[PDB]
Amino acid sequence: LLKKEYTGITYISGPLLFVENAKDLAYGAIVDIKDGTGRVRGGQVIEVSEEYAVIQVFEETTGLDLATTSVSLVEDVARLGVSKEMLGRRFNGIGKPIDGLPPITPEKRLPITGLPLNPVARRKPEQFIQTGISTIDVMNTLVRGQKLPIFSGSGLPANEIAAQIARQATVRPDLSGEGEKEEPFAVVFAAMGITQRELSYFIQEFERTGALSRSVLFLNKADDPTIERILTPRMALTVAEYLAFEHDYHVLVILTDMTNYCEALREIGAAREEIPGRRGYPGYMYTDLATIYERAGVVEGKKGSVTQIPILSMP
Amino acid sequence: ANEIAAQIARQATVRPDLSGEGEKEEPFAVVFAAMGITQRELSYFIQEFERTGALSRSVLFLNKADDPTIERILTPRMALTVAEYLAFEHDYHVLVILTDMTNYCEALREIGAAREEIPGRRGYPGYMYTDLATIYERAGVVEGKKGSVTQIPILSMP
Amino acid sequence: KKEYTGITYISGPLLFVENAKDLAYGAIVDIKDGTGRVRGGQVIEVSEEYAVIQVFEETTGLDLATTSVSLVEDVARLGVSKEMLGRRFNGIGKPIDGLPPITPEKRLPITGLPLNPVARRKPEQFIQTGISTIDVMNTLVRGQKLPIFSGSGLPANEIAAQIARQATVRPDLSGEGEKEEPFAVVFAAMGITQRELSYFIQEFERTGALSRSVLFLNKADDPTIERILTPRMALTVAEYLAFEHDYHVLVILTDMTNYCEALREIGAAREEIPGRRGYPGYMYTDLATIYERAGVVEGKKGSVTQIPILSMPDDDRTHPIPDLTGYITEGQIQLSRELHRKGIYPPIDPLPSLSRLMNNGVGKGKTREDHKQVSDQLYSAYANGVDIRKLVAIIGEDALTENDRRYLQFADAFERFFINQGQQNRSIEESLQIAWALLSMLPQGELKRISKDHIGKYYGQKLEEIWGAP
Amino acid sequence: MIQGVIQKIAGPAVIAKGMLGARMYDICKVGEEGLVGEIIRLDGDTAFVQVYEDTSGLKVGEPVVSTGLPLAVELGPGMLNGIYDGIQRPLERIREKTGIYITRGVVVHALDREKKWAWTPMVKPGDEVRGGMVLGTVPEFGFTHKILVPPDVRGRVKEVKPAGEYTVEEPVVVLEDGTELKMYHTWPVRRARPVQRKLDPNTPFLTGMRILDVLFPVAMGGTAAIPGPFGSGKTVTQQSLAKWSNADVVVYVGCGERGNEMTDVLVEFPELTDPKTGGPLMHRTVLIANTSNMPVAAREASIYVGVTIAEYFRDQGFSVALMADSTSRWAEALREISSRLEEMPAEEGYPPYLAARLAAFYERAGKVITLGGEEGAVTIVGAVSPPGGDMSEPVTQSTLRIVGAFWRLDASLAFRRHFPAINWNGSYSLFTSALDPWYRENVAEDYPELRDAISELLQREAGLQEIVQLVGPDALQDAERLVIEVGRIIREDFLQQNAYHEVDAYCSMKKAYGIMKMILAFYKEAEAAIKRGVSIDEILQLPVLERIGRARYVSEEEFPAYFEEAMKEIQGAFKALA
């Protein structure tokens, strides 16, 4: 397909830049921004009109100029290439490998924002999970298809609890007789603003357990650009939904420090001067969080299941 | 509050035999102004005035909860205009009841916010003091005239 | 010389002038209307189209047909001379005492250049203010910035006048006697009323303290940009004297709360978005450019010392004005309202007061060698006394032990004699004598903080000497 | 390069027209005086530039010239023994040509441009060169400085200058493509220098103060925070870390603070002596000093310059310790700058991205494998000053989320002259569980098991604090009097340390281990004697108690014989008593 470029930049300030004659850019498209030094930056269209279009940049705007910068379209809807060979890989949070292996060959391309599940098409989650912790198993039991966050503190060991839960979770079919064998969980791990110390602990625990051969890791370290923190959980949930509802896997999703996701959203909301909320957070945080949480559950007529254990720290 | 207001309107009378003014009593004329009143309170007020027999002496301005909001700007002004006319032209003793000033203040705040006026405390318009003063200050007694206007506003503290 | 007549907009304190691109930013201008009256003004914006002038005084009588604007100077400058000693100025350099204007040796920009951090040296000498509670327990050091925190009705002005009248250096206590040093006091008043102005005028002249002082006095009804300009001119004069004539100067800033309010009003007039609690976002830097002009310089004999005074709005130490001042200054002296209501003057509270440069000014070779331990012992004893006095009201006097009764009497004697000095002038030796006489009422060996050598040398004097003049 | 003229002046904000082609966040020269500023917003033919120093006296029409590069430091030989402000301007050479003040628009060079160095080439023509390798060595004090290529430079060596005396300006290596490599290069302060791989924090960073490296250790390449009030040791503990730690090069970064507080550290530091060589401590440290009245941009960009210099010294294979003093002042400067940009505030007036900046500063620490194959590490210790001791401030909350150690100070122990005055029930460390394999191999097998004994012994008195203020200590039962006395001697011999003493200012790890072993021996034998119904008064009079106090002041070489003799005496004392 042929490419098209727009060179009519008129205004740059902070994360936003204005393109004048961009009439045929779809709302929500992904563009590639190139400067005179050859560096390439990503961006997303957030407002399109007759007079101009508004593009926010996925990272810092140092080096851009109005004379030599050009904006080129990539795709109308942000999509991710999914495949069955992604098990056992590592990605940087915007879809690029970090492990140094060649990139995967996509089977399908799916939108990262997903689609809402039809409430008629759902079914009740019913299979009990034995995690091995008495305070959880007896009094707060976990069911396949549940979203159950951990309300951590500033210096409390929530990461160890999450690793122990992922290490010991089993379904115990003998208590019900509705199956056999020892069908294991696949694990999707998404980290937002994590530091090296906790990343090292997670990596060594996953390699010691041996479950790294059936896991997909999306890693966005704390020194990475802040706008990439928004996109990271959406692709992880896209992969989890694809695996569970197209290959009958039972996946488990772990989201680490979504407080970082909330501050990342607040930074953009303050930059876009939209109406705030209770403590400076944007007024639409409930909807954005719902678009992440409500992608779990089970579906009638299908064998797969999605389970989420988010981790957040109470300020 | 509505029951207390109804009881006051039912039982209120002067005591000429104590003050010695000599004039024998005649009942008050009631002017009733409701802004954003619900059916539950309106039926109670209607039944109370029916049982006490005060509907033959009363003028009612009703603005129910489903009626448009901007109409609440006008109702107290016309109620007090009628009260002033009766009291200072036909020598009636007029008692005025305003059901909820809070609903008047919300209707004023809507227009103030639509006009981008500078707000005061808690988002209310800065000129609310003058606007409320133009309503309350229409009661009183005039030298050389027999009539009088008495106001009992009712408001809900948030 | 040139005059601009293209006025296109007048509203409140601002007016716009057309074709004024030759006016520098921040310059001072003169505004003349049809009746010949002259008002001042300052340029706050320069552009290709128009310039914005903020007007001193009210804008009554101005019109778009007869108004003209002429330049005075590009940068605000002050003419300085040694003859300024004994003179009173209105806050922008204009004399108000009726004397002829001084002839300037130099004209310096009122905004000061920052001091090079490698050019400073550590403060090492003290100033005798004549107040026992300040000299003994919260000592002021040459080069220190020691603010005073006061309430609303407290006598901050009288304390300021007393300090300006009584402060002096003591070269006879230092080393081999040192050598005579010149001394001067620079006084800055901002937002004062007529009553305070008259009080200061009588006080500085009735006792001869005017002959060594320079007064910058700004009234409450004066234009508020002059209130911004006043402390910078005071610090400019102080820096000139100290670093070009080896003077030891002391700068008193009468009320920083008025300065902060004036800064807020000016910031609101130029359409700036406020920060915390309506105050400008750059108040920290603006206050740093005033406070950090004091200090002592390597290779020079002079020194600049500051005593800012500020009134806490609601006795709220978390208010922005006390909070930002605490990040830049070395301790504070707090006046107590409870001591003020009981008849004690000056009402300086020793418990929440602190001087952070005490350790480098006191000691052997610059004062008496028993200073530090005596101050520590006095603080520790008063802290016990003020709590034993509270316990007495519940458990009665009989239930205490003997030493608790000694502490209870010590607190009362301390408040009666040490703090309540009145209008007396006390040298450091007299204050130390009174301090050792007060400690004498405690038994020997209860004084844990003081070493045996000083205890054997100074303990045992009766309090009857100060009892002849309480 | 791009030049323009001033169109509008309004405070520090300057609008320059004719600036088509300038780039965001470039450094410009504003006015004829030569003021500097950053471009913060582009719009058509104009460019919004914010000046650092004040703009009084400027006129419309004065030229504006952009340098074409963002804020950057100069990295090369000659940075040791130097004093710089927030934007790497040497104060000593500014004094020589200006006086006691700092005039606006002064132009000086960060690196001396006229000093001869002893160049020694380690390459020959025809060699392949990639980013991060070594061209040669230059001696500098007690260090052999390595001349590295920039990370973005690769090619093939064409000509090499022979050994001799050269300045930093003289090109020493020229490549085949015409690129000239000098003794120095520039790097932006807000972009992290690349590495090959970041390793694990499996080695401890030794402080030399007993309580820190015993109870709340920090690993090499870790991050720590130390909050507290005035007179609480914040300053002394940092300058003791500077002298006694195992770091090769020390970087002290002082954000905008009081002038006399800066004068203290500027005066006392040249007096200090390096323990390893006996020479001045100034020979291995770089100082960044900023007062409260200097421009806010320098104060905000102070810490980035320091961390970039620390990264540059890391890239040569050294171990660097970075000390950020009073990051609350840096947060205040950031708040002021964000207020000048009319951003919407959050919390206590702070910009919404405060946590992102604090994270982006702290993550540059860590132990890495450099591009040249050598190993290096940067360790960061950052001081925090709460306004009134409240731990709910946004700065401390954001710092708590990222640091691996938290050494809380308190003035209650400073009132008792107990130094170091850290609170041992408020502090915590997260590197304990990862340092254990190193601990049980290098120190002793029982050390991780022994530390829990000290922790539990200190904990048990915190459960006895509800009875001691009611009933006097002497009235306690002997089974509790024993706990009280052994915990007391722990507090007065192991936790306390004299930083001014000749031998107490530095304690190796085996010395502390012997002290804990000996204290446990005392406690166990005393409990065994108490089980035999003896009075505790005779235990408090035992001669071994003074042997406990004297263990601090023994020399490092002299310790083992003293430890063995104390072990013999404490074994003889308790089972000689019936």
Added chain:
Amino acid sequence: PVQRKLDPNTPFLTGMRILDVLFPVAMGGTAAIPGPFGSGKTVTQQSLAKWSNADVVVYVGCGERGNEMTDVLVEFPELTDPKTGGPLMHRTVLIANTSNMPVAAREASIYVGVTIAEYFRDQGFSVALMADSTSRWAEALREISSRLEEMPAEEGYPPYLAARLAAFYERAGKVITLGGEEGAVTIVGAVSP
């Protein structure tokens, strides 16, 4: 439209002791049940759907979980109607708009539910209307007003919120329909502060 409105004089039985005894609500009145997260608003509303003596029950899931809507679809076709032998689902109308569904559609669901409840009132039935959460409707109004660049009153909410809420709760009551019959609508709305 209606002919007249009447005074409520018969209880609306919920099956809960504390609500039916200590704090009764009449046939044709309104009630609100605020509470934090985990208090039990949804269990209380589903119990009212299951056990109340209303002829027709309308449930409006305005901006809440989708699993709660699947629980109703699964459990109800098996349970028994309290006042007739048929299945419980034969008397229930569900309007579902979950949290991740489009925001602007939250406003329309409330009006659709109240219009259906009013329609069933005109036939002579007694209708119970349960709104799952009105704070989500308030948030939808806030987002639309943010897009309109209106000036917020408090907490970002538009200044006309109290008019819309008043217009919604007014529609309840016991009336004489245009056909001369008798009907009533009672509204129970949850709030999520």
Added chain:
Amino acid sequence: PVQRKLDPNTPFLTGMRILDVLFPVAMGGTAAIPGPFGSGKTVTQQSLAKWSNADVVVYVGCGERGNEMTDVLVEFPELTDPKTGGPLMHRTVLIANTSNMPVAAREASIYVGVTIAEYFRDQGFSVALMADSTSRWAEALREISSRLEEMPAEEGYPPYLAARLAAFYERAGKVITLGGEEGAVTIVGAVSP
């Protein structure tokens, strides 16, 4: 204009025990009495008008009720001036601007009252000036600044409010008039937070 300001040394007697004994005010001084509604601000000021020893009393009603001025007009002609024996109203000048009167006239009333008080100062009399509420002046300034579309400070008040308040209070004091006599003006101003 005046010839020379003087130092206040003579008390202003009001008849209140606590104010005269514990918190005295001199002849040329200024005072303020703030408080919430119902605290007693107006009754204190009317008692000061009734019983003080000033020669001429000027009362400025900036924005209060109208009955408060009807009471003065009805009562004062019947009382007796303490220091001359005649009616009390012969020494009193009233400037009235009630709440429902136009807003922009609130600013002018204060200046008219203070100018009349300064005029009676020049004849050798001692004048007491009382403002019933100085907060309503600030409210009028805010109302006008709202129409002028200029940016306010803190609570919506215009930036120049403090300068106006300072310039109003500094007109008080004991002076030597241009004719050689001695006069004094004392100002008491109520504040309504």
Added chain:
Amino acid sequence: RRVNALEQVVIPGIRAQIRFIQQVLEQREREDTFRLKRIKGKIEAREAEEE
């Protein structure tokens, strides 16, 4: 008993009240500066219709 009551009951409620009042005041201040930020932009947009 009095010491334990004052330590355990009275102080935490007072401190929670402090926190709640502080949060309310700060949130009101944020709402109030938002309006000024809008009004300055409206002023800037007004005087640009035909320069």
